[PDB]
């Protein structure tokens, strides 16, 4: 009993052939894929540069989450895709890549809703992270799901659940001729992620 | 030791800082403690106020915990700053509303859930709702000679897990609004004397608070 | 040297480990992305970006360090239990493969640096193999594979 | 550890707020989306009528069974389509709706590979069973793996694993101005599904 | 009541049918059976026959298990029966060949897995392969004036699991070949007396079955 | 975590690789393992052949392990490939020789020690030795009517502690040596026929093999 049901007076036993039979030498050794294996892993989001020309509390990557999570690129659009609602907490990781010759930072906030109006410097009170070019390129967040209703709806969304944004912590810095810019990565991954609600309506 | 630390590092930024040697400072001298949030905002704090030009005219207000909405219409002083420290809320609300001026008139105040059909918010015109379909949602009925004043406690009924104050747009609109109050006159005859009302909103024992946002920069918060 | 061993057999199964170096300064910083395509060699690898690479199975590296290698395993997979070695056949067959998958390097991050030090951190790429099997001798000058 | 590994000097312990939450009151009370709800679940395959003028031994309907399990329309599509390789049994319902008033039959034969040659007199060897005007309008055929490779190949299979045949067993008939016809239908599911070799190639 | 059953329905079609009274019918007489398959495919059977025309020129022919190549090049006679009547096969054959005609002629027989590079099938050429690469995969040198017959154990050695003989188009193509058989004669100089050879095909007792298939319709079964 | 390493240092050279999950991949399904060297070395290769112009002939060639002397003389297809992959070697080797063509040829063949008195390798010209001195260091005498092939063990007769592959100059012309094999005919009075020999050469498993090396860039391996 999963889903399809059928009800019948008339029906018989199905016939049988054989059985499983488990493979004494293996033709591939990785984990059979599953859910575990294919909506948790990690994904990339967004990609952009960080320049000495953003000014402080300049916003180099404004970033709606779960509204980039969903996309034919990724291998997670195969569940998302068949399901209508959705609940789950999120994973984030900043990867950047500082010369010591530079100098500066970062802040990374998970905001749940948006921004709206309150103030830039109280980044600090939402689950953050500093990045900076003294100590470390990398930050991991986690944040539990926050959300005004039961669960998320993928095909016309309320409100983006977590609006991540990035504001440039202190100027960044350099001395003559050192290179002026840094790669900046976004990655993310849904966690304990659970569907409900099947359909065939999004084809 | 304890005044080097690496706040890059969430892990040490729970560490206790110590710089210069200290004392314990004694004991708060007062009983009650101010700082619990279910006794500041236990006391009441000022939401809104409206008049009556005529006899026999309806007004309605929702009680929206939006922050776009600007005052005169909307959140004023304490609760427009309190509503936006944190995300969610939800539980029943304790209003207590205040009657002024004119004598001998009666009145009659419902409550109307999110969404349901119901008069235009912030707009003063005679009530186009049939008079069996107030009392069914429930309503007191109030003189202004004996009272004037009613304290009573909102119910919690949506289908919403929570509200939130912050928003923006499409969501804004719709999960924002906690609920609407009505209050209809009858008898105002004379139109002198001046009948005007006020609102006062309160937090219960019930109600709870989550997920602390940030404050609002200084421009936000306004006054009537 | 795993090449010279293999080059005399008909048949083989196991897991190559590539081991990468990057010899760079203390100064450099810098990220790669491995990326293993799970297939056949003759597939188009070339049209892939970026974003869809993360999907199948990659590590991320820095250059920054004292640790310069990594050890990347790729672990086995195919349809048929044994590959097999194509090169002494003269042309291509549908079904009949050799590699496993192709392999990807990617520029996950840019390569920064100051003024005095070169732009260009060169890395070598190492090759061995475990749990290898083996039959079917023969003899066989198995060409270079060039680009 | 799961497939995308990051490797790292300067990491760092991550940031949680909160933790999962369960719900004491359900916002959906059906089972959450899983492997095994989604990928085994009963799909449509092929749908034809069965009429007089088929003469003894004509084929109503020749399936190929994988080929036909992997399209945009089937929610399966969401797994298979990210994963190179994959092996796995099949069961297979096959129903039609006579009215007594007819009479006839019909064979379904769960055929590997292809038929080739061999006598189509002996299609009862094959797992295999019989419809029938006067018992049954139903049929359950369950076949384990079967193929000359470790695993099936999506993208360029070699050749189609279980290509499913439908003979008529017996000509129909009918009286007079009886309905001259009979709607036919074709089910399939994949079982104990297993899959490797993630990949994007397939976008 | 055996007499009657429902066949629509295969749980009963595993009854055992009566009709009419009977007795058990003794025993078989003679010891052996001849319906087990590792006894009557146990008797070797034919494959295939060619001459050779000129001296050092060598043959190839593949055993390739497919339906579709009909004889004189492919199975003939029973072994074309034999091995469509189940879907797959692994394990060792035993090969035995036969020499006839003339005398004093050198010879070297080697195997080649499939795939490698080997030479055209069912063609006569002169040999394209160094003969440092022949001996290398395995070969035995054999005289005709002493044996004329030879009896060899050719082995599994395939990256697929198993061998199909029912196949088409792009996999019959690959799948459905054992492997190459090659003979390479020497010293043949007088082209008179008409050296001819001829091969027979046996099933070990290590091979396997599955899957039983349907027999062949009569007009696939030919002779050469 | 095993996915990063200093291979710069040796002690870290043989952690345990791991990148990503996997399981035990089950058995290997042939019993014997083909990457034993007593097992790919246990089957022969080719060594050299040549033949034989006129009657009461002698030929004789060297079998040396060199690098530097490329074939028609010298080590062909895979033994020049496998001597040089180490570089010691010790103990007997397993000999097998083929006759093909003409009959009715007697023939004694004998082994000579590095550096005796011995025919100068590579040349075929009528024997210069006594033919005392021939049977005294043994040999055998075989008629090609009979037989035509010859399984013999070359023993171990050297005043080295072991012969090496890889050398240069002064030391390859003595060292590298391990032995000769010298083949008289007699009695071929007809130059016709054409009689040919080919030799073929095994390791045995009292052979050894010491401190591996590194095996040979493309251009150095050759075939005839």
């Given at each position: 009993?999963?889903?399809?049901?059928?009800?019948?007076?008339?029906?018989?036993?199905?016939?049988?052939?054989?059985?499983?039979?488990?493979e004494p030498?293996?033709?591939?050794?990785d984990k059979?894929?599953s859910?575990?294996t294919?909506?948790?892993k990690?994904?990339?989001?967004?990609?952009?540069?960080w320049?000495?020309?953003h000014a402080?509390?300049?916003?180099?990557?404004k970033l709606?989450?779960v509204?980039?999570?969903?996309?034919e690129?990724?291998?997670?659009?195969?569940?998302?895709?068949?399901?209508?609602?959705a609940?789950?907490?999120?994973?984030?990781?900043?990867q950047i890549?500082?010369?010591?010759?530079?100098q500066g930072?970062?802040?990374?906030?998970?905001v749940?809703?948006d921004?709206?109006?309150?103030s830039?410097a109280?980044?600090?009170?939402?689950?953050h992270?500093?990045?900076?070019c003294?100590?470390?390129?990398?930050?991991?967040?986690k944040?539990?799901?926050?959300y005004?209703?039961?669960?998320?709806?993928?095909?016309?969304?309320?409100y983006?659940?977590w609006?991540?944004?990035?504001r440039?912590?202190?100027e960044?810095?350099?001395?003559t001729?050192?290179?002026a810019?840094?790669?900046?990565n976004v990655?993310?991954?849904?966690t304990?992620?659970?569907?409900?609600?099947?359909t065939?309506?999004?084809? | 030791?304890g005044?080097?630390?690496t706040?890059?590092?969430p892990?040490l930024?729970?560490?206790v800082?110590?710089?210069?040697?200290?004392?314990?400072?004694?004991?708060?001298?007062?009983?009650?403690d101010?700082?619990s949030?279910?006794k500041?905002m236990?006391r009441?704090?000022?939401?809104?106020?409206?008049?009556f030009?005529?006899?026999?005219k309806?007004?309605?207000?929702?009680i929206?915990?939006?922050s776009?909405?600007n005052?005169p219409?909307?959140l004023?002083s304490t609760?427009?700053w309190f509503?936006?420290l944190f995300?969610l809320?939800?539980?029943?609300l304790?209003?207590?509303?205040?009657?002024?001026?004119?004598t001998?008139?009666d009145?009659?105040?419902?409550?109307?859930?999110?969404?349901?059909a119901?008069?235009?918010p912030?707009?003063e015109?005679?009530?186009?709702?049939?008079?069996?379909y107030?009392?069914?949602?429930?309503?007191?009925?109030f003189?202004?000679?004996?009272?004037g004043?009613?304290?009573?406690?909102?119910?919690?009924?949506?289908?919403?897990y929570?509200?939130?104050?912050?928003l923006?747009?499409?969501?804004?609109?719709?999960?924002s609004?906690?609920?609407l109050?009505?209050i209809?006159?009858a008898?105002y005859?004379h139109s002198?004397?001046?009948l005007?009302f006020?609102?006062?909103?309160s937090?219960?024992?019930q109600?709870?608070?989550?997920?602390p946002?940030?404050?609002?920069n200084?421009?936000?918060?306004?006054?009537? | 040297?795993?090449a010279?061993?293999?080059?005399m057999?008909?048949?083989?199964?196991?897991?190559?480990?590539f081991?990468?170096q990057?010899?760079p300064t203390?100064?450099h910083?810098?990220?790669?992305?491995?990326?293993?395509?799970p297939?056949?060699?003759?597939?188009?690898?070339?049209?892939?970006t970026l974003?869809?690479?993360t999907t199948?199975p990659?590590a991320?590296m820095?250059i920054?360090?004292?640790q310069?290698?990594?050890?990347?395993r790729?672990?086995?997979?195919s349809?048929t239990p044994?590959?097999?070695?194509?090169?002494?056949?003269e042309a291509?067959?549908?079904?009949?493969?050799?590699?496993?998958?192709?392999?990807?390097?990617?520029?996950?991050?840019?390569?920064?640096?100051?003024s005095n030090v070169?732009h260009?951190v060169?890395?070598?790429?190492?090759?061995?193999?475990?749990?290898?099997?083996c039959?079917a001798?023969?003899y066989h000058?198995?060409?270079?594979?060039?680009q």
């Open positions: 009993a999963s889903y399809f049901t059928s009800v019948d007076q008339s029906s018989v036993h199905t016939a049988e052939v054989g059985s499983h039979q488990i030498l293996k033709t591939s050794v059979p894929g859910k575990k294919q909506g948790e990690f994904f990339l989001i967004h990609s952009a540069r320049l000495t020309t402080l509390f300049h916003e180099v990557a709606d989450v509204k980039l999570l969903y996309n690129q990724f291998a997670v659009q195969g569940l998302l895709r068949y399901h209508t609602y609940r789950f907490g999120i994973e984030i990781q900043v890549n500082p010369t010591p010759f530079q930072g970062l802040i990374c906030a998970m749940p809703g921004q709206s109006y309150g830039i109280s980044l600090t009170v939402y689950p992270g500093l990045l900076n003294n100590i470390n390129n990398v930050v991991r967040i944040v539990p799901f926050i005004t209703r039961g669960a998320y709806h993928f095909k016309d969304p309320q983006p659940v609006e991540l944004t990035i440039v912590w202190s960044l810095n350099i001395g001729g050192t290179s810019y840094t790669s900046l990655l993310a991954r849904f304990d992620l659970e569907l409900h609600g099947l065939p309506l999004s084809t | 030791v005044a080097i630390t706040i890059e590092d892990v930024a729970k560490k800082p110590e710089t210069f040697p200290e004392l314990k400072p004694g004991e708060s001298r007062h009983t009650s101010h700082m949030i279910y500041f236990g009441s704090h000022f939401l809104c106020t409206f008049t030009n005529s006899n026999n309806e007004y309605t207000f929702p929206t915990l939006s776009t909405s005052p219409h909307g004023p609760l427009r509503f936006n995300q809320y939800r539980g029943p304790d209003l207590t509303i205040i009657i002024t001026g004119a001998d008139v009145g009659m105040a419902w409550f109307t859930p999110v969404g349901l119901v008069d235009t912030w707009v015109k005679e009530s186009a709702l049939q008079i069996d107030k009392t069914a949602l429930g309503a007191v009925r003189n202004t000679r004996r009272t004043n009613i304290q009573i406690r909102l119910p919690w009924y949506s289908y919403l929570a509200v939130s104050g912050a923006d747009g499409l969501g804004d609109k719709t999960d609004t906690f609920g109050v009505s209809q006159i008898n005859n002198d004397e001046y005007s006020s609102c006062y909103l937090v219960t024992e109600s709870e608070f989550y997920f946002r940030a404050p609002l200084s421009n936000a918060m306004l006054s009537t | 040297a795993l010279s061993i293999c080059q057999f008909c048949f083989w199964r196991g897991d190559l480990v081991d990468f990057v010899f203390k100064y910083s810098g990220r790669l992305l491995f990326c293993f395509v297939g056949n060699e003759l597939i188009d690898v070339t049209g892939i974003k869809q690479a199948a990659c991320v820095d920054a360090g004292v310069s290698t990594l050890r990347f790729v672990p086995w997979i349809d044994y590959r097999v070695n194509r090169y002494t056949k291509h067959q549908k079904g009949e493969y050799t590699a496993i998958g192709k392999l990807i390097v990617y520029c996950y991050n840019r390569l920064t640096s100051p070169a260009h060169r890395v070598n790429v190492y090759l061995s193999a475990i749990n290898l099997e039959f001798p023969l000058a198995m060409d270079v594979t060039t």
